Tab-separated table of N, CA and C in Angstrom:
chain	number	residue	atom	x	y	z
A	187	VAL	N	0.944	105.942	14.502
A	187	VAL	CA	0.464	104.714	13.664
A	187	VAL	C	-0.383	104.263	14.967
A	188	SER	N	-1.076	102.574	14.089
A	188	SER	CA	-1.659	101.491	15.244
A	188	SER	C	-1.457	101.173	15.906
A	189	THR	N	-1.960	101.417	17.417
A	189	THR	CA	-1.518	100.331	18.098
A	189	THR	C	-1.175	98.725	18.142
A	190	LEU	N	-0.625	98.084	19.122
A	190	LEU	CA	-0.381	96.618	19.383
A	190	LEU	C	-1.294	96.221	19.801
A	191	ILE	N	-1.475	94.908	19.980
A	191	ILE	CA	-2.892	94.496	20.332
A	191	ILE	C	-2.125	93.403	21.721
A	192	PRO	N	-1.430	93.341	22.511
A	192	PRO	CA	-0.693	93.064	23.589
A	192	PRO	C	-1.707	93.420	24.726
A	193	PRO	N	-2.374	94.637	25.080
A	193	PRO	CA	-2.810	95.355	26.255
A	193	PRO	C	-4.194	94.603	26.740
A	194	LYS	N	-4.963	94.040	25.575
A	194	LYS	CA	-6.109	93.553	26.000
A	194	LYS	C	-6.156	91.844	25.474
A	195	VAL	N	-4.915	91.572	25.651
A	195	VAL	CA	-4.526	90.221	25.803
A	195	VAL	C	-4.007	89.473	27.112
A	196	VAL	N	-4.381	89.171	27.835
A	196	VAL	CA	-4.251	88.315	29.116
A	196	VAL	C	-4.489	86.849	29.223
A	197	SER	N	-3.577	85.603	29.586
A	197	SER	CA	-3.975	84.391	29.658
A	197	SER	C	-2.662	84.196	30.323
A	198	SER	N	-1.800	84.444	30.480
A	198	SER	CA	-0.950	83.567	31.628
A	198	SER	C	0.123	84.436	32.591
A	199	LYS	N	-1.065	85.181	33.261
A	199	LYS	CA	-0.619	86.215	34.659
A	199	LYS	C	-1.242	84.680	35.492
A	200	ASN	N	-1.790	83.944	35.032
A	200	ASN	CA	-2.443	83.330	36.278
A	200	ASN	C	-1.217	82.000	36.265
A	201	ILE	N	-0.085	81.967	35.802
A	201	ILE	CA	0.795	81.045	36.288
A	201	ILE	C	2.138	81.975	36.458
A	202	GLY	N	1.844	83.206	35.897
A	202	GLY	CA	2.650	84.100	35.877
A	202	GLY	C	3.295	84.601	37.250
A	203	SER	N	2.609	84.720	38.346
A	203	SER	CA	2.915	84.565	39.618
A	203	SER	C	3.180	83.949	40.598
A	204	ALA	N	3.821	84.045	41.565
A	204	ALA	CA	4.007	82.464	42.734
A	204	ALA	C	2.392	82.478	43.379
A	205	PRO	N	1.645	83.391	43.677
A	205	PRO	CA	0.517	83.614	44.649
A	205	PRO	C	-0.634	82.800	44.148
A	206	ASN	N	-0.664	82.372	42.510
A	206	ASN	CA	-1.486	81.479	41.883
A	206	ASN	C	-1.049	79.748	42.419
A	207	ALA	N	0.239	79.787	42.878
A	207	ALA	CA	-0.013	78.236	43.184
A	207	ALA	C	-0.478	78.124	44.784
A	208	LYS	N	-0.089	79.303	45.159
A	208	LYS	CA	-0.898	79.295	46.768
A	208	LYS	C	-2.416	79.443	46.519
A	209	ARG	N	-2.942	80.121	45.861
A	209	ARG	CA	-4.551	80.425	45.324
A	209	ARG	C	-4.604	79.124	45.143
A	210	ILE	N	-4.107	78.085	44.353
A	210	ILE	CA	-4.782	76.792	43.999
A	210	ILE	C	-4.621	75.520	45.448
A	211	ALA	N	-3.635	76.107	46.145
A	211	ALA	CA	-3.702	75.484	47.465
A	211	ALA	C	-5.156	75.608	48.248
A	212	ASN	N	-5.202	76.881	48.423
A	212	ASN	CA	-5.830	77.728	49.374
A	212	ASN	C	-7.516	77.591	49.201
A	213	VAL	N	-7.641	77.278	47.749
A	213	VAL	CA	-8.901	77.048	47.607
A	213	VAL	C	-9.466	75.761	47.634
A	214	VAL	N	-8.199	74.931	48.060
A	214	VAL	CA	-8.768	73.417	48.662
A	214	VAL	C	-9.096	73.528	49.687
A	215	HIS	N	-7.862	74.064	50.472
A	215	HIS	CA	-7.836	73.920	51.801
A	215	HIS	C	-8.685	75.034	52.728
A	216	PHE	N	-8.924	75.812	52.054
A	216	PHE	CA	-9.506	77.083	52.443
A	216	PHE	C	-10.895	77.063	51.114
A	217	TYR	N	-11.994	76.417	51.941
A	217	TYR	CA	-13.406	76.549	51.113
A	217	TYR	C	-13.635	75.033	51.635
A	218	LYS	N	-13.118	73.836	51.844
A	218	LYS	CA	-13.391	73.016	52.655
A	218	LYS	C	-12.575	72.402	54.124
A	219	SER	N	-12.265	73.578	54.471
A	219	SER	CA	-11.827	73.959	55.647
A	219	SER	C	-12.814	74.109	56.681
A	220	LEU	N	-12.392	73.165	57.880
A	220	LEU	CA	-13.891	73.478	58.922
A	220	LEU	C	-13.203	74.302	59.993
A	221	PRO	N	-14.031	75.022	60.737
A	221	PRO	CA	-13.703	76.147	61.959
A	221	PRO	C	-12.970	75.750	62.646
A	222	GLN	N	-12.762	74.322	63.195
A	222	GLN	CA	-12.078	73.888	64.155
A	222	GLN	C	-11.729	72.766	64.025
A	223	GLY	N	-10.573	71.717	64.103
A	223	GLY	CA	-10.114	70.887	64.023
A	223	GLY	C	-10.815	69.748	64.777
A	224	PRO	N	-10.755	68.198	64.585
A	224	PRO	CA	-11.449	67.149	65.463
A	224	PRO	C	-11.064	66.950	66.778
A	225	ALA	N	-10.056	66.820	67.169
A	225	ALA	CA	-9.963	65.815	68.365
A	225	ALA	C	-8.432	66.271	68.998
A	226	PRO	N	-8.033	66.116	70.153
A	226	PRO	CA	-7.404	66.503	70.704
A	226	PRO	C	-6.723	64.785	71.545
A	227	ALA	N	-7.173	63.713	71.012
A	227	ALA	CA	-7.743	62.497	71.469
A	227	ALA	C	-8.763	62.423	72.832
A	228	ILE	N	-9.329	61.105	72.927
A	228	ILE	CA	-10.950	61.101	73.939
A	228	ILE	C	-10.918	59.850	73.947
A	229	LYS	N	-10.392	58.889	73.359
A	229	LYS	CA	-10.519	57.091	73.440
A	229	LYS	C	-9.985	56.924	74.611
A	230	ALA	N	-10.229	55.904	75.343
A	230	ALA	CA	-9.930	55.128	76.443
A	230	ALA	C	-10.673	54.818	77.293
A	231	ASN	N	-11.881	55.041	76.833
A	231	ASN	CA	-13.268	54.710	77.962
A	231	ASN	C	-13.321	52.995	78.412
A	232	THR	N	-13.529	53.286	79.328
A	232	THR	CA	-13.989	51.763	80.213
A	232	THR	C	-14.029	52.347	81.777
A	233	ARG	N	-14.220	53.784	81.729
A	233	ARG	CA	-14.173	54.625	82.925
A	233	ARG	C	-12.552	54.819	83.222
A	234	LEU	N	-11.755	54.980	82.156
A	234	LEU	CA	-10.666	55.261	81.926
A	234	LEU	C	-10.530	56.349	80.741
A	235	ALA	N	-11.636	56.897	79.975
A	235	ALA	CA	-11.502	57.827	79.011
A	235	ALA	C	-11.771	59.159	79.971
A	236	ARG	N	-11.845	58.910	81.210
A	236	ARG	CA	-11.660	59.784	82.181
A	236	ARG	C	-10.449	60.053	82.788
A	237	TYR	N	-9.401	59.061	82.992
A	237	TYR	CA	-8.367	58.578	83.379
A	237	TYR	C	-7.189	59.645	82.394
A	238	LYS	N	-7.575	59.426	80.883
A	238	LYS	CA	-7.001	60.115	80.328
A	238	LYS	C	-7.145	61.589	79.865
A	239	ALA	N	-8.481	61.835	80.090
A	239	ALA	CA	-8.930	63.324	79.870
A	239	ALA	C	-8.667	63.940	80.937
A	240	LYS	N	-8.241	63.574	82.274
A	240	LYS	CA	-8.143	64.506	83.516
A	240	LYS	C	-6.210	64.741	83.223
A	241	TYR	N	-5.613	63.355	82.643
A	241	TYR	CA	-4.169	63.354	82.528
A	241	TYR	C	-3.376	63.366	81.590
A	242	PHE	N	-3.933	62.895	80.649
A	242	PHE	CA	-3.193	62.626	79.418
A	242	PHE	C	-4.137	63.510	78.288
A	243	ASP	N	-4.745	64.615	78.400
A	243	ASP	CA	-5.294	65.302	77.601
A	243	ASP	C	-4.251	67.033	77.729
A	244	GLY	N	-4.300	67.358	76.381
A	244	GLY	CA	-3.775	68.656	76.420
A	244	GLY	C	-3.759	69.909	77.552
A	245	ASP	N	-4.626	69.604	78.287
A	245	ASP	CA	-4.931	70.506	79.445
A	245	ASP	C	-4.098	70.363	80.381
A	246	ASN	N	-3.462	69.167	80.424
A	246	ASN	CA	-2.145	69.194	81.475
A	246	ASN	C	-1.554	68.164	81.308
A	247	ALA	N	0.144	68.186	81.833
A	247	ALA	CA	0.678	67.130	81.796
A	247	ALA	C	1.435	67.729	83.225
A	248	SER	N	1.086	66.545	84.047
A	248	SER	CA	1.237	66.869	85.342
A	248	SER	C	1.529	65.350	86.184
A	249	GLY	N	1.875	65.480	87.422
A	249	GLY	CA	2.466	64.254	87.626
A	249	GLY	C	1.729	62.962	88.291
A	250	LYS	N	0.398	63.344	88.321
A	250	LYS	CA	-0.820	62.608	88.704
A	250	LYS	C	-0.687	60.920	87.916
A	251	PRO	N	-1.062	61.209	86.688
A	251	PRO	CA	-0.826	59.773	85.981
A	251	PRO	C	0.327	58.915	86.488
A	252	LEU	N	1.810	59.461	86.465
A	252	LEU	CA	2.584	58.980	86.990
A	252	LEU	C	2.720	58.488	88.079
A	253	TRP	N	2.183	58.586	88.889
A	253	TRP	CA	1.873	58.297	90.400
A	253	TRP	C	1.015	57.128	90.230
A	254	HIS	N	-0.233	56.948	89.201
A	254	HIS	CA	-0.906	56.141	89.393
A	254	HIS	C	-0.409	54.907	88.713
A	255	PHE	N	0.360	55.181	87.688
A	255	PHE	CA	0.694	54.184	86.785
A	255	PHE	C	1.819	53.250	87.584
A	256	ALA	N	2.651	54.322	88.422
A	256	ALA	CA	3.502	53.625	89.171
A	256	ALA	C	3.190	52.815	90.402
A	257	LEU	N	2.171	53.044	91.072
A	257	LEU	CA	1.088	52.358	92.146
A	257	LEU	C	1.089	50.939	91.475
A	258	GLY	N	0.341	51.323	90.166
A	258	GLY	CA	-0.298	49.675	89.676
A	258	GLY	C	0.534	48.629	89.827
A	259	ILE	N	1.797	48.729	89.449
A	259	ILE	CA	3.114	47.714	89.708
A	259	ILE	C	3.193	47.638	90.801
A	260	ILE	N	3.529	48.615	91.672
A	260	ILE	CA	3.592	48.526	93.411
A	260	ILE	C	2.435	47.614	93.618
A	261	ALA	N	1.601	47.678	93.242
A	261	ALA	CA	0.357	46.805	93.836
A	261	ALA	C	0.726	45.475	93.731
A	262	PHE	N	1.070	44.973	92.199
A	262	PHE	CA	1.059	43.707	91.538
A	262	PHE	C	2.296	43.191	92.417
A	263	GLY	N	3.493	43.749	92.590
A	263	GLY	CA	4.399	42.869	93.310
A	263	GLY	C	4.390	43.055	94.834
A	264	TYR	N	3.598	44.241	95.442
A	264	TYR	CA	3.362	44.104	96.729
A	264	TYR	C	2.862	42.992	97.164
A	265	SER	N	1.440	42.764	96.704
A	265	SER	CA	0.785	41.567	96.613
A	265	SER	C	1.655	40.375	96.965
A	266	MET	N	2.185	40.140	95.725
A	266	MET	CA	3.126	38.828	95.357
A	266	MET	C	4.024	38.994	96.110
A	267	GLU	N	4.420	39.800	97.172
A	267	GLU	CA	5.497	39.676	97.806
A	267	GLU	C	4.839	38.639	98.855
A	268	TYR	N	3.659	38.773	99.375
A	268	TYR	CA	3.289	37.771	100.386
A	268	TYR	C	2.607	36.712	99.892
A	269	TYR	N	2.835	36.543	98.638
A	269	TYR	CA	3.040	35.390	97.703
A	269	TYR	C	4.343	34.569	97.750
A	270	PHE	N	5.344	35.445	97.792
A	270	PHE	CA	6.496	35.104	98.095
A	270	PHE	C	7.024	34.704	99.457
A	271	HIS	N	6.158	35.095	100.233
A	271	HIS	CA	6.585	34.899	101.767
A	271	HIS	C	5.607	35.021	102.541
B	92	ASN	N	9.243	178.077	-20.196
B	92	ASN	CA	10.453	178.180	-20.946
B	92	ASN	C	11.260	177.191	-21.785
B	93	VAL	N	12.238	176.975	-20.791
B	93	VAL	CA	13.423	175.936	-21.051
B	93	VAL	C	12.600	174.597	-20.432
B	94	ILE	N	11.625	174.955	-19.473
B	94	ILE	CA	10.461	173.783	-18.840
B	94	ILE	C	9.755	173.459	-20.048
B	95	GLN	N	9.060	174.229	-20.792
B	95	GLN	CA	8.311	174.227	-22.064
B	95	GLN	C	9.152	173.353	-22.677
B	96	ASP	N	9.783	173.707	-23.447
B	96	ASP	CA	11.007	173.104	-24.188
B	96	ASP	C	11.024	171.569	-24.181
B	97	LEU	N	11.758	171.550	-22.999
B	97	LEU	CA	12.110	170.017	-22.139
B	97	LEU	C	10.583	169.257	-22.338
B	98	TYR	N	9.729	170.181	-21.979
B	98	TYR	CA	8.310	169.412	-21.352
B	98	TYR	C	7.908	168.638	-22.904
B	99	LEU	N	7.907	169.587	-23.940
B	99	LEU	CA	7.511	169.243	-24.863
B	99	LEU	C	7.939	167.773	-26.190
B	100	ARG	N	9.412	168.239	-25.729
B	100	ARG	CA	10.217	167.691	-26.289
B	100	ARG	C	10.381	166.360	-26.134
B	101	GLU	N	10.400	166.010	-24.593
B	101	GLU	CA	10.171	164.959	-24.119
B	101	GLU	C	9.068	163.840	-24.478
B	102	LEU	N	7.839	164.774	-24.271
B	102	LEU	CA	6.797	164.301	-24.521
B	102	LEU	C	6.454	163.644	-25.522
B	103	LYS	N	6.973	164.388	-26.312
B	103	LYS	CA	6.642	164.486	-27.807
B	103	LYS	C	7.254	162.999	-28.601
B	104	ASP	N	8.327	163.096	-28.478
B	104	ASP	CA	9.547	162.467	-29.182
B	104	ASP	C	9.833	161.225	-29.177
B	105	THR	N	9.372	160.572	-27.713
B	105	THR	CA	9.341	159.111	-27.278
B	105	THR	C	8.517	159.448	-25.791
B	106	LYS	N	7.504	158.813	-25.919
B	106	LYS	CA	6.422	158.726	-24.559
B	106	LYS	C	7.425	157.836	-23.811
B	107	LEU	N	6.698	156.427	-24.135
B	107	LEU	CA	7.293	155.340	-23.534
B	107	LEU	C	8.793	154.799	-24.460
B	108	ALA	N	9.871	154.003	-23.895
B	108	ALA	CA	10.629	153.254	-24.301
B	108	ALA	C	10.060	151.957	-25.004
B	109	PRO	N	10.422	151.421	-25.852
B	109	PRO	CA	9.625	149.751	-26.341
B	109	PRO	C	9.855	148.832	-24.681
B	110	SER	N	9.103	147.630	-24.800
B	110	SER	CA	8.784	146.505	-23.811
B	110	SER	C	8.376	145.798	-24.901
B	111	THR	N	8.286	144.545	-24.246
B	111	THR	CA	7.872	143.251	-24.699
B	111	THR	C	7.643	142.254	-23.388
B	112	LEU	N	6.288	142.125	-24.035
B	112	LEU	CA	5.543	140.752	-23.210
B	112	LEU	C	6.385	139.376	-23.202
B	113	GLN	N	6.344	138.887	-24.159
B	113	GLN	CA	7.033	137.682	-24.529
B	113	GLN	C	8.350	137.740	-24.150
B	114	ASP	N	9.308	138.506	-23.895
B	114	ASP	CA	11.110	138.633	-23.606
B	114	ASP	C	10.651	138.319	-21.623
B	115	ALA	N	9.843	138.739	-21.095
B	115	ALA	CA	9.906	138.671	-19.680
B	115	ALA	C	9.742	137.488	-19.466
B	116	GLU	N	9.037	136.440	-20.030
B	116	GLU	CA	8.346	135.433	-19.961
B	116	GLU	C	9.433	134.378	-19.548
B	117	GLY	N	10.764	134.442	-19.862
B	117	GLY	CA	11.859	133.709	-19.980
B	117	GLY	C	12.453	134.190	-18.968
B	118	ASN	N	12.494	135.537	-18.433
B	118	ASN	CA	13.075	135.654	-17.104
B	118	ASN	C	12.275	135.585	-15.789
B	119	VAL	N	11.205	135.116	-15.826
B	119	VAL	CA	10.342	134.767	-14.766
B	119	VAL	C	10.264	133.472	-14.792
B	120	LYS	N	9.598	132.897	-13.337
B	120	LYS	CA	9.783	131.594	-12.968
B	120	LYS	C	8.026	131.029	-13.852
B	121	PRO	N	7.809	130.271	-14.805
B	121	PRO	CA	6.350	130.038	-15.028
B	121	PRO	C	5.841	128.981	-14.272
B	122	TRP	N	4.728	129.166	-14.202
B	122	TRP	CA	3.786	128.608	-13.450
B	122	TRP	C	4.073	126.558	-14.008
B	123	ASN	N	3.945	125.633	-13.205
B	123	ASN	CA	4.155	124.449	-13.377
B	123	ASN	C	3.206	124.017	-12.503
B	124	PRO	N	2.717	122.423	-12.873
B	124	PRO	CA	1.121	122.189	-11.779
B	124	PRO	C	1.964	121.192	-10.967
B	125	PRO	N	1.469	121.128	-9.773
B	125	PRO	CA	1.925	120.227	-9.074
B	125	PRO	C	1.579	118.511	-9.602
B	126	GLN	N	2.365	117.564	-9.360
B	126	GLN	CA	2.149	116.159	-10.073
B	126	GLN	C	1.621	115.349	-9.035
B	127	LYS	N	0.310	114.583	-9.656
B	127	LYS	CA	-0.545	113.708	-9.300
B	127	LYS	C	-0.951	114.172	-8.069
B	128	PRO	N	-2.525	113.796	-7.863
B	128	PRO	CA	-3.405	114.336	-6.822
B	128	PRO	C	-3.016	113.445	-5.322
B	129	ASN	N	-2.417	112.202	-5.886
B	129	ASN	CA	-2.220	111.170	-4.777
B	129	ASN	C	-3.271	110.799	-4.296
B	130	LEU	N	-3.363	109.008	-3.402
B	130	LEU	CA	-4.211	108.633	-2.574
B	130	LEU	C	-3.302	107.925	-1.976
B	131	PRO	N	-3.645	108.471	-0.386
B	131	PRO	CA	-3.110	107.375	0.166
B	131	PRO	C	-3.349	105.799	0.317
B	132	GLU	N	-2.183	104.774	0.656
B	132	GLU	CA	-1.918	103.441	0.475
B	132	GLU	C	-3.277	103.255	1.444
B	133	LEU	N	-3.593	101.771	1.384
B	133	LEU	CA	-4.648	101.296	2.024
B	133	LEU	C	-3.939	100.686	3.118
B	134	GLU	N	-3.831	101.645	4.381
B	134	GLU	CA	-2.612	100.798	5.703
B	134	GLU	C	-3.470	99.853	6.270
B	135	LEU	N	-2.845	98.956	6.365
B	135	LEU	CA	-2.928	97.466	7.004
B	135	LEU	C	-4.043	96.910	6.591
B	136	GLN	N	-4.458	96.937	5.186
B	136	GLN	CA	-5.828	96.537	4.914
B	136	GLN	C	-5.814	94.926	5.137
B	137	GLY	N	-6.967	94.833	5.745
B	137	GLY	CA	-7.516	93.460	5.809
B	137	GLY	C	-6.899	92.744	7.103
B	138	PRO	N	-7.481	91.509	7.868
B	138	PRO	CA	-6.919	90.914	8.689
B	138	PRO	C	-5.777	89.952	8.541
B	139	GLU	N	-4.942	90.053	7.291
B	139	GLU	CA	-3.848	89.606	6.965
B	139	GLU	C	-2.814	89.898	8.090
B	140	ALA	N	-2.689	91.046	8.371
B	140	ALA	CA	-1.990	91.893	9.582
B	140	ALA	C	-2.586	91.643	10.435
B	141	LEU	N	-3.877	91.442	11.196
B	141	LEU	CA	-4.154	91.081	12.297
B	141	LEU	C	-4.035	89.727	12.395
B	142	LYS	N	-4.228	88.764	11.854
B	142	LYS	CA	-3.920	87.133	11.921
B	142	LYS	C	-2.621	87.165	12.603
B	143	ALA	N	-1.655	87.682	11.533
B	143	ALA	CA	0.003	87.949	11.841
B	143	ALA	C	0.014	88.572	13.107
B	144	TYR	N	-0.759	89.356	13.892
B	144	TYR	CA	-0.500	90.394	14.686
B	144	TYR	C	-0.825	89.870	16.071
B	145	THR	N	-2.189	88.879	16.235
B	145	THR	CA	-2.410	88.040	17.216
B	145	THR	C	-1.703	86.716	17.318
B	146	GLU	N	-1.219	86.307	16.479
B	146	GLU	CA	-0.262	85.212	16.529
B	146	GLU	C	1.445	85.674	17.288
B	147	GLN	N	2.127	86.564	16.700
B	147	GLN	CA	2.926	87.238	16.741
B	147	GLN	C	3.359	87.787	18.280
B	148	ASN	N	2.231	88.509	18.379
B	148	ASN	CA	2.104	89.121	19.907
B	148	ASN	C	0.955	88.551	20.249
B	149	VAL	N	1.037	87.558	20.881
B	149	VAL	CA	-0.019	86.919	21.523
B	149	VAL	C	0.544	87.115	23.330
B	150	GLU	N	1.533	88.327	23.344
B	150	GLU	CA	1.994	88.796	24.728
B	150	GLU	C	0.826	89.248	25.694
B	151	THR	N	1.213	88.668	26.875
B	151	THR	CA	-0.157	88.830	27.838
B	151	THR	C	0.669	90.352	28.051
B	152	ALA	N	-0.597	90.735	29.337
B	152	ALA	CA	-0.079	92.656	29.853
B	152	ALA	C	-0.126	91.572	31.410
B	153	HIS	N	1.155	92.253	31.795
B	153	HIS	CA	1.421	91.459	33.284
B	153	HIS	C	1.576	93.175	34.077
């Protein structure tokens, strides 16, 4: 007898599976995606964007800024020692 | 001799024995006609079924 009409009806496979949710996510995310992100920090300029760039970038974490930062406070109180003495 | 006597007697005095076609009819199956030419009923006639089917099974194909 005469075949039923379901095989030629589709209209809820688009909620029917899980990658639909991911699809509607990644059509927004990827379509308006940039090839590369914006920045790993770069502001501190006054001849100190260089200080941050050399020391406090993702390029390295090394003891050089620590030494520098320590020395600033040492220079304050060391001069003040002779202001107190 | 006796052959001739029998031949003559037999043939002459009764050739065939009685028979009647009318009597035969009772003892044999009579022709009887098929009843109705028949016409097949209109199967699933019209969109009454279709409108019903589209609604009934709106089932998708997954």
